[PDB]
Amino acid sequence: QVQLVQSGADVKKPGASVKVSCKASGYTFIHFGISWVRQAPGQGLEWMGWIDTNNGNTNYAQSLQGRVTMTTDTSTGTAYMELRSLSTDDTAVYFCARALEMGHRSGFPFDYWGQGVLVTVSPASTKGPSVFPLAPTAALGCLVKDYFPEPVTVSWNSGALTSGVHTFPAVLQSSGLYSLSSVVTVPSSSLGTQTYICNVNHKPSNTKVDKRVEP
Amino acid sequence: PCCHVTLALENISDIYLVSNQTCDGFSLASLNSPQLVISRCANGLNVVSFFISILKRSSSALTGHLRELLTTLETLYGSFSVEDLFGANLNRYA
Amino acid sequence: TWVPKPNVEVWPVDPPPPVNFNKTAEQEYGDKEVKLPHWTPTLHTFQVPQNYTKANCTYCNTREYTFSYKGCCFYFTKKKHTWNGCFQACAELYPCTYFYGPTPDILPVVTRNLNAIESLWVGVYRVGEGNWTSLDGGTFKVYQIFGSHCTYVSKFSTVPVSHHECSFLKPCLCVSQ
Amino acid sequence: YELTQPPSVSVAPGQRATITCGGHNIGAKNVHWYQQKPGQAPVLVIQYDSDRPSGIPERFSGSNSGSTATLTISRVEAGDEADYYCQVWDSGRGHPLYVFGGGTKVTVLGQPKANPTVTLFPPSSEELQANKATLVCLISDFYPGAVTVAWKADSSPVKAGVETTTPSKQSNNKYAASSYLSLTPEQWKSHRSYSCQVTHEGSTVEKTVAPT
Amino acid sequence: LSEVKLHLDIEGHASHYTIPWTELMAKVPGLSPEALWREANVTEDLASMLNRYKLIYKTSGTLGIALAEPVDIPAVSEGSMQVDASKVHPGVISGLNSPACMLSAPLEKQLFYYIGTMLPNTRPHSYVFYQLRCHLSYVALSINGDKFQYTGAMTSKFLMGTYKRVTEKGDEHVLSLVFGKTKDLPDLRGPFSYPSLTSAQSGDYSLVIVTTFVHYANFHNYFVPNLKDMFSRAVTMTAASYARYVLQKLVLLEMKGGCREPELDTETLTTMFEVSVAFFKVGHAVGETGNGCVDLRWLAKSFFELTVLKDIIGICYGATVKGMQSYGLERLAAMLMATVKMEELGHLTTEKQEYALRLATVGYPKAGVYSGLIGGATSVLLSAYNRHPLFQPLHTVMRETLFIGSHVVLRELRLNVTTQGPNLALYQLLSTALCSALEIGEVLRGLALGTESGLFSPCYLSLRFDLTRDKLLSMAPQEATLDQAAVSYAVDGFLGRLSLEREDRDAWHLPAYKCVDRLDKVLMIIPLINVTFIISSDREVRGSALYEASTTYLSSSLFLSPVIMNKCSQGAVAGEPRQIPKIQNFTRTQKSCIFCGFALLSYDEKEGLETTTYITSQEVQNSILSSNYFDFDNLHVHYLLLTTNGTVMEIAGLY
Ligand SMILES: *[C@@H]1O[C@H](CO)[C@@H](O[C@@H]2O[C@H](CO)[C@@H](O[C@@H]3O[C@H](CO[C@H]4O[C@H](CO)[C@@H](O)[C@H](O)[C@@H]4O)[C@@H](O)[C@H](O[C@H]4O[C@H](CO)[C@@H](O)[C@H](O)[C@@H]4O[C@H]4O[C@H](CO)[C@@H](O)[C@H](O)[C@@H]4O)[C@@H]3O)[C@H](O)[C@H]2NC(C)=O)[C@H](O)[C@H]1NC(C)=O
Ligand SMILES: *[C@@H]1O[C@H](CO)[C@@H](O)[C@H](O)[C@H]1NC(C)=O
Ligand SMILES: *[C@@H]1O[C@H](CO)[C@@H](O)[C@H](O)[C@H]1NC(C)=O
Ligand SMILES: *[C@@H]1O[C@H](CO)[C@@H](O)[C@H](O)[C@H]1NC(C)=O
Ligand SMILES: *[C@@H]1O[C@H](CO)[C@@H](O)[C@H](O)[C@H]1NC(C)=O
Ligand SMILES: *[C@@H]1O[C@H](CO)[C@@H](O)[C@H](O)[C@H]1NC(C)=O
Ligand SMILES: *[C@@H]1O[C@H](CO)[C@@H](O)[C@H](O)[C@H]1NC(C)=O
Ligand SMILES: *[C@@H]1O[C@H](CO)[C@@H](O)[C@H](O)[C@H]1NC(C)=O
Ligand SMILES: *[C@@H]1O[C@H](CO)[C@@H](O)[C@H](O)[C@H]1NC(C)=O
């Protein structure tokens, strides 16, 4: 079939640079060009550029020109795209697509799209969370706040507790940091018996927190 | 005058062609009957290609001034853009 | 004793026929006015050959199968058949067996049993405008290139691949247990 | 060349869902349509003004003429709920590019309204010791995915310190969101009570917590 | 009908011209402005006009490859005679030593005799070109249940090929390629121009892609031609050299088991285009003569190659050809052949032999009548045989000469008609004798690399049947510069060529064949005067006698049996096979030729047949006796001679 595998996703800071890698498979690489498009959260699709995989010809968006480079590695079938002088406004998901042809007087639609990669730009650096309980049928949970970057996950009783558990997506604070919460609904009478411990795992800073929630 | 395009060959007595400047890039032709004269607004681009083809098809039978005309028509034709119409108001003369 | 022999010669042939200079251009080339030829493709719709379906019993000859995996025996029909031919060819060859479509899991298993030259017909077909399936049901990924219902696999095949012609002769992939 | 597209549309199931895109002489251009679902890459559904590739259901059609391009889904199904975009090629006057329109969110009606489950939690002991008093308001399992959340302290509305998420699709095919109010231990103790007021379908859900 | 006065603004000047109709229509007997007027659709609005524009595929840009075209047709020799193709009659020309040229004008008229539609009004065409009817010719075929077809239509001015593929849904995709000189390309419909469509442009020639965006996208999935290479070759090669290029590819493709099951890949589709071009190039070259004449030798070369190309493609794919066949030239060629003796062609200057052979091929199309040409080909081969050094892998020149002659031989082998059996048999015998181990090696190399040594080989028509993969590999080239996998593949190709299931391997021209009960057990056939000898591993054969050669315990049996006057007996002779008497009392020096008409062969006790020779003259006998062929120090190799008396003798030694 036709496949595109994308990687190089990361979290950067303003002024930095990123290179996205897109691997082609299932077809002759040089027979089709490659298109790049950006999509920020809640936004539409912005054409970034196109490259000729056989001849090295490129077409860049005017808004990117000077801070964007495209190139390919013919022998592996891998395309690369570099962005420089990053800004917070460049936070977006980037996609590659199979672009048959493009030129000064023509161009084709894009039959196949890759999975895409998420690139985040923020001046904030790595920060482990502070963790507090959300004391309480009854609902009880944990609050994990003031951390960076995403994702952070929380399990209960080392995964033992599943059904009844719900997790709320992290909110971005005005301070530029994140906060999430997780709750579970249990019989009110079980609060005098069963112990409920959150197991918070913030991988970006090797941080693990075991938090018991009491009435 | 410029017009909006929207008939036997033998029913035309005269044909009038214009430059690109006249109608802002819209190549138009004016056809008319033979007194009593009824005019028609015709697609200039098609009219020109029509005559060019005829002259080439009959190239072996052409005379001096007809070969000159062929060159002239081809010249004008080559000078007439098409793509610019993507920005122009196609109903400008409607 | 030996006797001298004459050189080898070419056997004499008849003189050429005369040239018919009285044959006119009209005779040399009849029907001056001609038209370019065209052909009309024969179209028909493939439908499941309900005469045969997935076998419903266990069986395996331990020296007839080509390779095995899990609880199934895999066969490559030696005789070369058309894609359609495979359905009946296997059914009429062994006790419970059927024309089989490779799964995302199994396909790697069979591809490792194929060289870069041979091409194997597989039990994968289109139902509607899609939903490529098999006798075991399920949905298969197919490398749709040509407007045909037949697919095949080979050494470098990651999925069943479509093909412009079903009439070509290839080994059939069938299974048993 | 900028293309014009409507914000969103929501239609009854089984109807001839119709999406349009505006543009000068758009009929003269080859318009392509892409479909996108959350978490997925955009997929080409229609190209070159009503040409569709294999894999696209026969209920999908469209056309393009004059100043308007259009896409139509016959007997629209809930599974057809997705964002759609119009794209054209542009010669760029020497700087050739592709251009997408704003895009349209296309939904299908069917799912009934649902009231949110709202839980409001007062500051934890450890949190207060840390010199913080953030109030946590958790809102879940509602429909449609749009609510308004206000905070109040005793008799007065609270504006400062309020931070709120955008509603998002849950595993229950419903929506959830959360809101936080960042207070100091002093501010918390200074008021009789605090509350989280959530508006949904014109109704109000109000939860109250207090230092006591 | 009605004269029209046309006025037009020329740089501000209101100039006008008068447009007469009948004054021109009377001179151009096929021009009808009314029909074109309808097509012109001058009432068409801007919207629909633009709709057409957006439909048609546009080419990203033009390669812009500079190159020079060679001169195919030479100046007319001072001493040449002028030939009018429309006035060909018994006189004016006699003998092969007289230079002459044929007038292009009547030649062109014959080549493009037929008239019809060049540019039809179909889905991908009515939106591009104006309807065109004219003198034309074409090559066309269909494959894969006719789900796919291709038409290589062309004119004396330009070529336009069309690729059509139909899906099982009834949907179809069409792509066309237009090639020729820019200045005379067919008129486009509406406001279109070639610079927007042209993919390649040279000084005079250009290549234009005509299709729709939707179809283009489809074709590209499998058909992605190398336009740069294709375009250049199409101009820089001569008509003769171009056609040879095309032919070689076709032959190799078919021979390897290609078109048996046609694959719709780029390679094959590209080939179809190139074939179409080859015909165009020749017709074009004639048109591009300034109404002068063309040397007969040039014509012979050009038509010979197309003739062969036609015969082969008509079998491989079953393609047909309409036009590009001049009866005038054919009659002249037949006249020329009628002034010479076929039997004596081998005594002519090599240059003249090739000339005669090419002429013969054309003069008697499809070898349908004058079978005497076979004797001609034999005369040539035999003379070569008597010049060629023992067991050597021919020579570039020899190969070309024989290649040409082999065509008429191949034609005869398509029909099970016993005409001139004896000559055809000799031809095969001589060919067999020349098929040495060195030849096998040279051929396999040529096949692996794709050279003329793979294209033509006498071995292909030999009567040696004991060749297999293992043997061919043992005789394979042993160089580190070769791809060993490619070589083994070349072997499979070679074996395929010789397959008993191939039409020209049937050998039903040989009466003796009937004596064969098991073809699969036949090792070699040697057709001698008054006797054919069959070498096989089968005890049973309807011969007059049976001998068994010495071999090792585990070796295949080596049975030899003569058929007297090619008359089959009632069955194998009962009892055990005879032994062969040995000759020791014989000198290497001999007074004269005593083995003329006899066959000499040798074999290895383990490997079997190694060499075959045939004594045709004193020089041949001398060469062999004087050589170290008779290796009496090798106790694993034996030498046998077959006489016309139906007997065999073994050589023990030579003084
Ligand atoms: C010589 O010149 C004449 C003069 O123009 C020309 O006739 C014109 O032919 C074209 C088609 O070849 C006509 O244009 C359209 O043709 C389609 C045909 O069906 C196909 O295409 C549609 C859409 O792409 C597909 O859905 C369908 O399956 C087929 O593929 C017609 O369907 C079009 O009808 C429209 O107009 C009708 C009347 O106004 C409406 O009732 C109908 O719903 C369609 O409306 C659409 O287009 C309108 C255009 O402004 C638009 O406003 C609507 O909202 C809607 O989008 C249409 O016929 C063209 O009309 C013909 N001209 C005239 C005057 O009839 C000849 O073909 C030409 N000769 C040659 C050789 O080219
Ligand atoms: C012009 O059109 C009319 C209307 O059909 C027709 O009768 C007449 O013959 C046509 N030709 C001329 C020269 O008037
Ligand atoms: C407009 O007409 C003039 C007249 O000769 C021509 O030279 C010019 O190039 C035309 N316009 C354009 C934009 O080419
Ligand atoms: C050709 O016509 C001439 C004149 O009538 C005649 O003498 C000659 O025999 C004819 N040839 C044939 C083959 O009929
Ligand atoms: C079992 O297999 C046979 C094979 O022909 C089939 O006819 C029959 O319906 C199958 N039974 C079931 C329950 O599928
Ligand atoms: C077709 O494929 C889909 C996979 O997305 C599957 O769910 C459905 O059951 C399949 N079969 C039919 C008839 O829809
Ligand atoms: C060739 O053999 C076939 C039968 O195998 C026969 O029908 C055909 O007529 C033969 N050809 C000729 C010219 O006799
Ligand atoms: C043997 O060959 C010679 C030479 O061709 C021939 O004359 C003779 O008649 C042949 N023998 C028979 C029995 O025909
Ligand atoms: C052929 O053999 C017969 C029988 O021995 C013999 O009489 C005759 O002379 C032989 N012919 C030759 C040419 O040796």
Coordinates of N, CA, C and O in Angstrom, one line a residue, chain E residues 296-345:
Chain E
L296 N 18.4 2.9 -53.2 CA 17.7 1.6 -53.0 C 18.3 0.9 -51.8 O 17.6 0.2 -51.1
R297 N 19.6 1.1 -51.5 CA 20.2 0.4 -50.4 C 19.7 0.9 -49.1 O 19.4 0.1 -48.2
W298 N 19.5 2.2 -49.0 CA 18.9 2.8 -47.8 C 17.5 2.2 -47.6 O 17.2 1.8 -46.5
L299 N 16.7 2.2 -48.6 CA 15.4 1.7 -48.5 C 15.4 0.3 -48.1 O 14.6 -0.1 -47.3
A300 N 16.3 -0.5 -48.7 CA 16.3 -1.9 -48.3 C 16.6 -2.1 -46.9 O 15.9 -2.9 -46.2
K301 N 17.5 -1.3 -46.3 CA 17.8 -1.4 -44.9 C 16.6 -1.0 -44.0 O 16.3 -1.7 -43.1
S302 N 16.0 0.1 -44.4 CA 14.9 0.6 -43.6 C 13.7 -0.3 -43.6 O 13.1 -0.6 -42.6
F303 N 13.3 -0.8 -44.8 CA 12.2 -1.7 -44.9 C 12.5 -3.1 -44.4 O 11.6 -3.7 -43.8
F304 N 13.7 -3.5 -44.6 CA 14.0 -4.8 -44.0 C 13.7 -4.9 -42.5 O 13.1 -5.8 -42.0
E305 N 14.3 -3.9 -41.8 CA 14.1 -3.9 -40.4 C 12.6 -3.8 -40.0 O 12.2 -4.5 -39.0
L306 N 11.9 -2.9 -40.6 CA 10.5 -2.8 -40.3 C 9.7 -4.1 -40.6 O 8.8 -4.5 -39.9
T307 N 10.1 -4.7 -41.7 CA 9.5 -6.0 -42.1 C 9.7 -7.0 -41.1 O 8.7 -7.7 -40.7
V308 N 10.9 -7.1 -40.5 CA 11.2 -8.0 -39.5 C 10.4 -7.7 -38.2 O 9.7 -8.5 -37.6
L309 N 10.4 -6.4 -37.9 CA 9.7 -5.9 -36.7 C 8.2 -6.3 -36.8 O 7.6 -6.8 -35.8
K310 N 7.6 -6.1 -38.0 CA 6.3 -6.5 -38.2 C 6.0 -8.0 -38.0 O 5.1 -8.4 -37.2
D311 N 6.9 -8.8 -38.6 CA 6.7 -10.2 -38.5 C 6.8 -10.7 -37.0 O 6.0 -11.6 -36.6
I312 N 7.7 -10.1 -36.3 CA 7.9 -10.6 -34.9 C 6.8 -10.1 -34.0 O 6.2 -10.8 -33.2
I313 N 6.4 -8.8 -34.0 CA 5.4 -8.3 -33.1 C 4.1 -8.9 -33.4 O 3.3 -9.1 -32.5
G314 N 3.8 -9.3 -34.7 CA 2.6 -9.9 -35.1 C 2.4 -11.3 -34.5 O 1.4 -11.9 -34.6
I315 N 3.5 -11.8 -33.9 CA 3.5 -13.1 -33.3 C 3.5 -13.0 -31.8 O 2.7 -13.6 -31.0
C316 N 4.5 -12.2 -31.3 CA 4.6 -12.0 -29.8 C 3.4 -11.4 -29.2 O 2.9 -12.0 -28.2
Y317 N 2.8 -10.3 -29.8 CA 1.6 -9.7 -29.2 C 0.4 -10.0 -30.1 O -0.7 -9.9 -29.7
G318 N 0.7 -10.3 -31.4 CA -0.5 -10.4 -32.3 C -0.9 -9.1 -32.8 O -2.1 -8.9 -33.2
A319 N 0.1 -8.1 -32.9 CA -0.2 -6.8 -33.4 C -0.4 -6.8 -34.9 O 0.2 -7.7 -35.6
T320 N -1.1 -5.9 -35.4 CA -1.3 -5.8 -36.9 C -0.8 -4.4 -37.4 O -0.7 -3.4 -36.6
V321 N -0.4 -4.4 -38.6 CA 0.1 -3.2 -39.3 C -0.6 -2.8 -40.5 O -0.9 -3.7 -41.4
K322 N -1.1 -1.6 -40.6 CA -1.8 -1.1 -41.8 C -1.0 0.0 -42.5 O -0.7 1.0 -41.9
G323 N -0.6 -0.2 -43.7 CA 0.2 0.8 -44.5 C 1.7 0.5 -44.3 O 2.1 -0.5 -43.8
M324 N 2.5 1.5 -44.8 CA 3.9 1.4 -44.8 C 4.4 0.2 -45.5 O 5.4 -0.4 -45.1
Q325 N 3.8 -0.1 -46.6 CA 4.2 -1.2 -47.5 C 4.1 -0.8 -48.9 O 2.9 -0.7 -49.4
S326 N 5.2 -0.7 -49.6 CA 5.2 -0.2 -51.0 C 5.3 -1.3 -52.0 O 6.4 -2.0 -52.1
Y327 N 4.3 -1.6 -52.8 CA 4.3 -2.6 -53.8 C 5.3 -2.3 -54.9 O 5.9 -3.2 -55.5
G328 N 5.6 -1.0 -55.1 CA 6.5 -0.6 -56.1 C 7.9 -1.1 -55.8 O 8.5 -1.8 -56.6
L329 N 8.3 -0.9 -54.6 CA 9.6 -1.3 -54.1 C 9.7 -2.8 -54.1 O 10.7 -3.4 -54.5
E330 N 8.6 -3.5 -53.7 CA 8.6 -4.9 -53.7 C 8.8 -5.5 -55.0 O 9.6 -6.5 -55.2
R331 N 8.1 -5.0 -56.0 CA 8.3 -5.5 -57.4 C 9.7 -5.3 -57.9 O 10.2 -6.2 -58.5
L332 N 10.3 -4.2 -57.6 CA 11.6 -3.9 -58.1 C 12.6 -4.9 -57.4 O 13.5 -5.5 -58.1
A333 N 12.4 -5.2 -56.1 CA 13.3 -6.1 -55.4 C 13.1 -7.5 -56.0 O 14.1 -8.2 -56.2
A334 N 11.9 -7.9 -56.3 CA 11.7 -9.2 -56.9 C 12.3 -9.3 -58.3 O 12.9 -10.3 -58.7
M335 N 12.3 -8.2 -59.1 CA 13.0 -8.1 -60.4 C 14.4 -8.3 -60.2 O 15.1 -9.1 -61.0
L336 N 15.0 -7.7 -59.2 CA 16.5 -7.8 -59.0 C 16.8 -9.3 -58.6 O 17.8 -9.8 -59.1
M337 N 16.0 -9.9 -57.8 CA 16.3 -11.3 -57.5 C 16.2 -12.2 -58.7 O 17.0 -13.2 -58.8
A338 N 15.4 -11.8 -59.6 CA 15.2 -12.7 -60.8 C 16.4 -12.6 -61.7 O 16.4 -13.4 -62.7
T339 N 17.3 -11.7 -61.5 CA 18.5 -11.6 -62.4 C 19.7 -12.3 -61.8 O 20.7 -12.3 -62.4
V340 N 19.5 -13.0 -60.7 CA 20.7 -13.6 -60.0 C 20.3 -15.1 -59.7 O 19.2 -15.4 -59.5
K341 N 21.4 -15.9 -59.5 CA 21.2 -17.3 -59.2 C 21.3 -17.5 -57.7 O 22.3 -17.2 -57.0
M342 N 20.2 -18.0 -57.1 CA 20.2 -18.1 -55.6 C 21.3 -19.0 -55.1 O 22.0 -18.7 -54.2
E343 N 21.6 -20.1 -55.9 CA 22.6 -21.1 -55.5 C 24.0 -20.5 -55.4 O 24.9 -21.0 -54.7
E344 N 24.2 -19.4 -56.2 CA 25.6 -18.8 -56.3 C 25.7 -17.6 -55.4 O 26.8 -16.9 -55.5
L345 N 24.8 -17.2 -54.6 CA 24.9 -16.0 -53.9 C 26.0 -16.0 -52.9 O 26.6 -14.9 -52.6

